Amino acid sequence: GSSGSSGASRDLLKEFPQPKNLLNSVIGRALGISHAKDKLVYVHTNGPKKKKVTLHIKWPKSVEVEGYGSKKIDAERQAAAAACQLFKGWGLLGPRNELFDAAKYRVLADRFGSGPSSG
C-alpha cells in the first residue's frame, strides 16, 4: 500500500453498525464468549466535554482503541467499531464480515502471539 496515515475521516460505524455484537462474536468464536469478556476491556474517562472509552483488546494481539460519543453507549459503540477495522484487515472477519471456523481462528491468533499454551 502507498497511503496509510492515522485518522479516519469517514464514519467507521457505516461499515460496522453493531460493533458490540460483531466484535464480541469474533473473539467469542475463536476463544469463547465467556473468555472474550476479559479479552475486550472498556475504560471510561472523565474531564473532556464528551465522554471517551478506551477499548483495551488482547486477542488476537494486545491493542487498544478510543471511542467517542454523547452517551455511554454512544462512546462504547465507537471504540468497538474502531477495532472492527483491525479485525477485518488482519483477516479475522473478511471482505463481507464473514467469520471463519474455530480451527482457523486458533491459527490466526497464533501468528499474532503464542500465550502459555503450546497448542
Side-chain angles (χ1 to χ4, degrees):
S2 210
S3 210
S5 289
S6 61
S9 297
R10 296 182 84 161
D11 304 48
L12 284 165
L13 280 179
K14 304 268 92 184
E15 300 281 281
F16 320 109
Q18 275 299 75
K20 199 162 274 292
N21 272 315
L22 196 175
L23 200 77
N24 200 70
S25 286
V26 177
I27 304 166
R29 174 159 295 190
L31 318 169
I33 293 150
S34 69
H35 293 286
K37 289 207 202 86
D38 34 278
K39 304 289 153 192
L40 300 179
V41 193
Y42 292 62
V43 178
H44 278 262
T45 205
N46 192 47
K49 197 162 201 150
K50 60 210 72 160
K51 298 284 270 87
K52 184 162 88 209
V53 161
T54 302
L55 162 65
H56 278 255
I57 314 161
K58 311 301 188 270
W59 189 100
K61 32 179 276 162
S62 61
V63 200
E64 321 76 50
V65 297
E66 282 170 324
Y68 288 59
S70 306
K71 274 189 275 202
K72 173 207 88 275
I73 179 71
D74 282 57
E76 285 201 39
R77 279 185 86 188
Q78 271 289 303
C84 293
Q85 69 180 22
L86 297 167
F87 282 74
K88 210 155 157 194
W90 283 339
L92 296 160
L93 287 167
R96 292 283 281 169
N97 329 314
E98 270 44 296
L99 305 181
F100 292 132
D101 320 334
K104 189 190 200 272
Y105 276 124
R106 309 302 298 200
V107 180
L108 286 169
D110 205 74
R111 80 179 270 163
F112 281 126
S114 295
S117 301
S118 76

Coordinates of all heavy atoms in Angstrom, one line a residue, residues 67-119:
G67 N -13.1 5.5 21.8 CA -14.4 5.6 21.3 C -15.1 6.8 21.9 O -15.3 7.0 23.1
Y68 N -15.6 7.7 20.9 CA -16.3 8.9 21.3 C -17.8 8.8 21.2 O -18.3 7.9 20.5 CB -15.8 10.1 20.5 CG -14.4 10.6 20.8 CD1 -13.3 9.7 20.7 CD2 -14.1 11.9 21.2 CE1 -12.0 10.1 21.0 CE2 -12.8 12.3 21.5 CZ -11.8 11.4 21.4 OH -10.5 11.8 21.7
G69 N -18.5 9.6 21.9 CA -20.0 9.6 21.8 C -20.6 10.4 22.9 O -20.0 10.8 23.9
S70 N -21.9 10.7 22.7 CA -22.7 11.6 23.6 C -22.9 10.8 24.9 O -22.6 11.3 26.0 CB -24.0 12.0 23.0 OG -23.8 12.6 21.7
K71 N -23.5 9.6 24.8 CA -23.9 8.8 26.0 C -22.9 7.7 26.1 O -22.0 7.5 25.2 CB -25.3 8.3 25.9 CG -26.3 9.2 26.4 CD -27.7 8.5 26.5 CE -28.4 8.6 25.1 NZ -29.9 8.4 25.3
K72 N -23.0 7.0 27.2 CA -22.1 5.8 27.5 C -22.1 4.9 26.3 O -21.0 4.5 25.8 CB -22.5 5.1 28.8 CG -21.7 3.8 29.0 CD -22.5 2.8 29.8 CE -23.4 2.0 28.9 NZ -24.7 2.6 28.6
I73 N -23.3 4.4 25.9 CA -23.4 3.5 24.8 C -22.8 4.1 23.5 O -22.1 3.4 22.8 CB -24.9 3.2 24.5 CG1 -25.0 2.2 23.3 CG2 -25.7 4.4 24.3 CD1 -24.5 0.8 23.6
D74 N -23.1 5.4 23.2 CA -22.6 6.0 22.1 C -21.1 5.9 22.0 O -20.5 5.5 20.9 CB -23.0 7.5 22.1 CG -24.4 7.7 21.6 OD1 -25.3 7.1 22.3 OD2 -24.6 8.5 20.7
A75 N -20.4 6.2 23.1 CA -18.9 6.1 23.1 C -18.5 4.7 23.0 O -17.6 4.4 22.1 CB -18.4 6.7 24.4
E76 N -19.0 3.8 23.8 CA -18.6 2.4 23.8 C -18.7 1.8 22.4 O -17.8 1.1 22.0 CB -19.5 1.6 24.8 CG -19.2 1.8 26.2 CD -19.7 0.7 27.1 OE1 -19.6 -0.5 26.7 OE2 -20.1 1.0 28.2
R77 N -19.8 2.2 21.7 CA -20.0 1.7 20.4 C -18.8 2.0 19.5 O -18.2 1.1 18.9 CB -21.3 2.3 19.8 CG -22.6 1.7 20.2 CD -23.8 2.3 19.5 NE -24.0 1.6 18.2 CZ -24.9 2.1 17.3 NH1 -25.6 3.2 17.6 NH2 -25.1 1.5 16.2
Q78 N -18.5 3.3 19.4 CA -17.3 3.7 18.6 C -16.1 2.8 18.9 O -15.6 2.2 18.0 CB -17.0 5.2 18.8 CG -17.8 6.1 17.9 CD -17.3 6.1 16.5 OE1 -16.1 6.3 16.2 NE2 -18.2 5.8 15.6
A79 N -15.6 2.9 20.1 CA -14.5 2.1 20.5 C -14.4 0.8 19.8 O -13.5 0.5 19.0 CB -14.5 1.9 22.0
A80 N -15.4 -0.1 20.0 CA -15.5 -1.4 19.4 C -15.4 -1.3 17.9 O -14.6 -2.0 17.3 CB -16.8 -2.1 19.8
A81 N -16.1 -0.4 17.3 CA -16.1 -0.2 15.8 C -14.7 0.2 15.4 O -14.3 -0.2 14.3 CB -17.1 0.9 15.4
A82 N -14.0 0.9 16.2 CA -12.6 1.3 15.9 C -11.7 0.1 15.8 O -10.6 0.2 15.1 CB -12.1 2.3 16.9
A83 N -12.1 -1.0 16.4 CA -11.3 -2.2 16.4 C -11.7 -3.1 15.2 O -10.9 -3.8 14.6 CB -11.4 -2.9 17.7
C84 N -13.0 -3.1 15.0 CA -13.6 -4.0 13.9 C -12.7 -3.9 12.6 O -12.5 -4.8 11.9 CB -15.0 -3.6 13.6 SG -16.2 -3.9 14.9
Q85 N -12.3 -2.6 12.3 CA -11.5 -2.4 11.1 C -10.2 -3.2 11.2 O -9.7 -3.7 10.2 CB -11.2 -0.9 11.0 CG -10.2 -0.4 12.1 CD -9.9 1.1 11.9 OE1 -10.7 1.8 11.3 NE2 -8.8 1.5 12.5
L86 N -9.6 -3.3 12.4 CA -8.4 -4.0 12.6 C -8.6 -5.5 12.3 O -7.7 -6.2 11.7 CB -7.8 -3.8 14.0 CG -7.4 -2.4 14.4 CD1 -7.2 -2.3 15.9 CD2 -6.2 -2.0 13.6
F87 N -9.7 -6.1 12.8 CA -10.0 -7.5 12.6 C -10.2 -7.8 11.2 O -9.9 -8.9 10.7 CB -11.2 -7.9 13.5 CG -11.0 -8.0 14.9 CD1 -10.7 -6.9 15.7 CD2 -10.9 -9.3 15.5 CE1 -10.5 -7.1 17.1 CE2 -10.7 -9.5 16.8 CZ -10.4 -8.4 17.6
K88 N -10.8 -6.8 10.4 CA -11.1 -7.0 9.0 C -9.8 -7.1 8.2 O -9.6 -8.1 7.4 CB -12.0 -5.9 8.5 CG -12.9 -6.2 7.3 CD -14.1 -5.3 7.3 CE -14.7 -5.3 5.9 NZ -15.6 -4.2 5.7
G89 N -8.9 -6.1 8.4 CA -7.7 -6.1 7.7 C -6.8 -7.3 8.1 O -6.1 -7.9 7.2
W90 N -6.8 -7.6 9.4 CA -6.0 -8.8 9.9 C -6.4 -10.1 9.2 O -5.5 -10.9 8.8 CB -6.1 -8.9 11.4 CG -5.4 -7.9 12.1 CD1 -4.3 -7.1 11.7 CD2 -5.6 -7.4 13.5 NE1 -3.8 -6.3 12.7 CE2 -4.6 -6.5 13.8 CE3 -6.5 -7.8 14.5 CZ2 -4.5 -5.8 15.0 CZ3 -6.4 -7.2 15.7 CH2 -5.5 -6.2 16.0
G91 N -7.7 -10.3 9.0 CA -8.1 -11.5 8.4 C -9.0 -12.3 9.3 O -9.0 -13.6 9.2
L92 N -9.6 -11.7 10.3 CA -10.5 -12.4 11.2 C -11.9 -12.3 10.9 O -12.7 -13.1 11.2 CB -10.2 -11.8 12.6 CG -8.8 -12.0 13.2 CD1 -8.6 -11.0 14.4 CD2 -8.6 -13.5 13.7
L93 N -12.3 -11.2 10.1 CA -13.6 -11.0 9.7 C -13.8 -11.4 8.2 O -14.6 -12.3 7.9 CB -14.0 -9.6 9.9 CG -14.3 -9.2 11.4 CD1 -14.4 -7.7 11.5 CD2 -15.6 -9.8 11.9
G94 N -13.1 -10.6 7.4 CA -13.2 -10.9 5.9 C -13.7 -9.7 5.2 O -13.9 -8.6 5.7
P95 N -14.0 -9.9 3.9 CA -14.4 -8.8 3.0 C -15.9 -8.4 3.3 O -16.2 -7.2 3.3 CB -14.3 -9.4 1.6 CG -14.4 -10.9 1.8 CD -13.8 -11.1 3.1
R96 N -16.7 -9.4 3.6 CA -18.1 -9.1 3.9 C -18.4 -9.5 5.4 O -19.5 -9.9 5.7 CB -19.0 -10.0 3.0 CG -19.0 -9.6 1.5 CD -19.8 -8.3 1.3 NE -21.2 -8.6 1.2 CZ -22.2 -7.7 1.3 NH1 -21.9 -6.4 1.3 NH2 -23.5 -8.0 1.2
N97 N -17.4 -9.3 6.2 CA -17.6 -9.5 7.6 C -18.0 -10.9 7.9 O -18.9 -11.2 8.7 CB -18.5 -8.5 8.3 CG -18.5 -7.2 7.6 OD1 -17.4 -6.6 7.3 ND2 -19.7 -6.6 7.3
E98 N -17.5 -11.9 7.2 CA -17.8 -13.3 7.3 C -16.8 -14.0 8.2 O -15.7 -14.4 7.7 CB -17.9 -14.0 6.0 CG -19.3 -13.9 5.3 CD -20.0 -12.5 5.5 OE1 -20.2 -12.1 6.6 OE2 -20.2 -11.8 4.5
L99 N -17.2 -14.3 9.4 CA -16.3 -15.0 10.4 C -15.8 -16.3 9.7 O -16.2 -16.6 8.6 CB -17.1 -15.3 11.7 CG -17.8 -14.2 12.4 CD1 -18.5 -14.7 13.6 CD2 -16.7 -13.1 12.7
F100 N -14.9 -17.0 10.5 CA -14.3 -18.2 10.0 C -14.5 -19.3 11.0 O -15.2 -19.2 12.0 CB -12.8 -18.0 9.7 CG -12.5 -17.1 8.6 CD1 -11.6 -16.0 8.7 CD2 -13.2 -17.2 7.4 CE1 -11.3 -15.2 7.7 CE2 -12.9 -16.4 6.3 CZ -12.0 -15.3 6.5
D101 N -13.9 -20.5 10.7 CA -14.1 -21.7 11.5 C -13.1 -21.5 12.7 O -12.0 -21.0 12.6 CB -13.8 -22.9 10.7 CG -14.3 -22.9 9.3 OD1 -15.4 -22.2 9.1 OD2 -13.8 -23.6 8.5
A102 N -13.5 -22.1 13.9 CA -12.7 -22.0 15.1 C -11.3 -22.4 14.8 O -10.4 -21.6 15.0 CB -13.3 -23.0 16.1
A103 N -11.1 -23.6 14.3 CA -9.7 -24.0 13.9 C -8.9 -22.9 13.3 O -7.8 -22.6 13.8 CB -9.8 -25.2 13.0
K104 N -9.4 -22.3 12.3 CA -8.7 -21.2 11.6 C -8.4 -20.1 12.6 O -7.2 -19.6 12.6 CB -9.6 -20.6 10.5 CG -8.9 -19.6 9.6 CD -9.9 -18.9 8.6 CE -9.1 -18.3 7.4 NZ -8.6 -16.9 7.7
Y105 N -9.3 -19.7 13.4 CA -9.1 -18.6 14.4 C -7.9 -19.0 15.3 O -7.1 -18.1 15.6 CB -10.4 -18.5 15.2 CG -11.4 -17.5 14.6 CD1 -12.7 -18.0 14.4 CD2 -11.1 -16.3 14.2 CE1 -13.6 -17.2 13.9 CE2 -12.0 -15.4 13.7 CZ -13.3 -15.9 13.5 OH -14.2 -15.1 12.9
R106 N -7.8 -20.2 15.7 CA -6.7 -20.7 16.5 C -5.4 -20.3 15.9 O -4.4 -19.9 16.6 CB -6.8 -22.2 16.7 CG -8.2 -22.7 17.2 CD -8.6 -22.0 18.5 NE -7.6 -22.3 19.6 CZ -7.9 -22.1 20.9 NH1 -9.1 -21.7 21.2 NH2 -7.0 -22.4 21.8
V107 N -5.2 -20.6 14.6 CA -4.0 -20.3 13.9 C -3.8 -18.8 13.6 O -2.7 -18.2 13.8 CB -4.0 -21.0 12.5 CG1 -2.7 -20.7 11.8 CG2 -4.1 -22.5 12.7
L108 N -4.9 -18.1 13.3 CA -4.9 -16.7 13.1 C -4.4 -15.9 14.3 O -3.7 -14.9 14.1 CB -6.3 -16.2 12.7 CG -6.9 -16.5 11.4 CD1 -8.3 -16.2 11.3 CD2 -6.1 -15.8 10.3
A109 N -4.6 -16.4 15.5 CA -4.2 -15.8 16.7 C -2.7 -16.2 17.0 O -2.0 -15.5 17.7 CB -5.1 -16.2 17.9
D110 N -2.4 -17.4 16.5 CA -1.0 -17.9 16.8 C 0.0 -17.0 16.1 O 1.0 -16.6 16.7 CB -0.9 -19.4 16.2 CG 0.2 -20.2 16.9 OD1 0.0 -20.5 18.1 OD2 1.3 -20.4 16.3
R111 N -0.2 -16.8 14.8 CA 0.7 -15.9 14.1 C 0.9 -14.6 14.7 O 1.9 -13.9 14.5 CB 0.2 -15.7 12.6 CG -0.9 -14.7 12.5 CD -1.3 -14.5 11.1 NE -0.5 -13.5 10.4 CZ -0.5 -13.4 9.0 NH1 -1.2 -14.2 8.3 NH2 0.2 -12.4 8.5
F112 N -0.1 -14.2 15.5 CA 0.0 -12.9 16.2 C 0.7 -13.0 17.6 O 1.5 -12.2 18.0 CB -1.4 -12.4 16.5 CG -2.0 -11.7 15.3 CD1 -3.3 -12.1 14.8 CD2 -1.4 -10.7 14.6 CE1 -3.8 -11.6 13.7 CE2 -1.9 -10.1 13.5 CZ -3.2 -10.5 13.0
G113 N 0.4 -14.1 18.3 CA 1.1 -14.4 19.5 C 0.8 -15.8 20.1 O -0.1 -16.4 19.7
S114 N 1.7 -16.3 20.9 CA 1.6 -17.6 21.5 C 1.7 -17.5 23.0 O 2.7 -17.5 23.6 CB 2.7 -18.5 21.0 OG 2.6 -18.7 19.6
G115 N 0.5 -17.5 23.6 CA 0.4 -17.5 25.1 C 1.1 -18.6 25.7 O 2.0 -19.3 25.2
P116 N 0.7 -18.9 27.0 CA 1.3 -20.0 27.8 C 0.9 -21.4 27.2 O 1.4 -22.4 27.7 CB 0.7 -19.8 29.2 CG -0.6 -19.1 28.9 CD -0.3 -18.2 27.8
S117 N 0.0 -21.4 26.2 CA -0.4 -22.7 25.6 C 0.4 -23.0 24.4 O 0.7 -22.1 23.6 CB -1.9 -22.5 25.2 OG -2.7 -22.3 26.3
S118 N 0.8 -24.3 24.3 CA 1.6 -24.7 23.1 C 0.7 -25.1 21.9 O 1.2 -25.0 20.8 CB 2.5 -25.9 23.5 OG 1.7 -27.1 23.6
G119 N -0.5 -25.4 22.2 CA -1.4 -25.8 21.1 C -1.4 -27.2 20.8 O -0.7 -27.7 19.8

